[PDB]
Symmetry: C3
Subunit: 31 residues, 3 copies
């Protein structure tokens, strides 16, 4: 069960990194 | 304790989905 | 191990709050 939680956290972190990169692109586009 | 962690992960995932939808709207607006 | 998971969740929540604030700024800028 702890491994399943950790795997889900991995997925969340990867998505968060992707979101930050999307935001960086939006800031560049309007910069 | 594991259930509390899992509930918090649920909240994080829901917010992440909301953020992705906000980003999609911003991209549409500037598209 | 549960504490390490909880600490990571703390980091994720803080980053999510930061992302929401970045999005609010972008919405204000294009508003
Ligand atoms: Cl996020």
């Amino acid at each position: 069960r702890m491994k399943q939680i950790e795997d889900k956290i991995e997925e969340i972190l990867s998505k968060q990194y992707h979101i930050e990169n999307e935001i960086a692109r939006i800031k560049k586009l309007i910069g």
